[PDB]
Amino acid sequence: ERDAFDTLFDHAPDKLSVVKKSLITFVNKHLNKLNLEVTELETQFADGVYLVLLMGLLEDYFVPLHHFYLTPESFDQKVHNVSFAFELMLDGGLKKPKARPEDVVNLDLKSTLRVLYNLFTKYKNVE
Secondary structure, eight states: OOOTTGGGGSOOOOTTHHHHHHHHHHHHHHHGGGTOOOSOTTTTTTTSHHHHHHHHHHTTOOOOGGGSOSSOOSHHHHHHHHHHHHHHHHHTTOOOOSSOHHHHHTTOHHHHHHHHHHHHHHHTTOO
């Protein structure tokens, strides 16, 4: 059952379509191992959960739930989660992300795509 907002996410061709499709394939290769699926880059990384779990999968370590918010309710909890993912990235050798964690939670595509594309570049070959 659809509203007018839902129509904004129907696929229209754009200049970043090949880039986006490749990122979705990449995140799903890992997340699907946890029965998680991404279909929509524009919104599904905003709350920080999947990025935290993606880091666990890419670096191959357990990330206990007490480190982050599996069910973030507030803006602060999502900012927390994205910020924690960024710390996992930085500690694994990656350069400090340009994005502010608030920009990811606030649905900025440029910040979100840049974060994911950097993960793809470093972790392309992790099976």
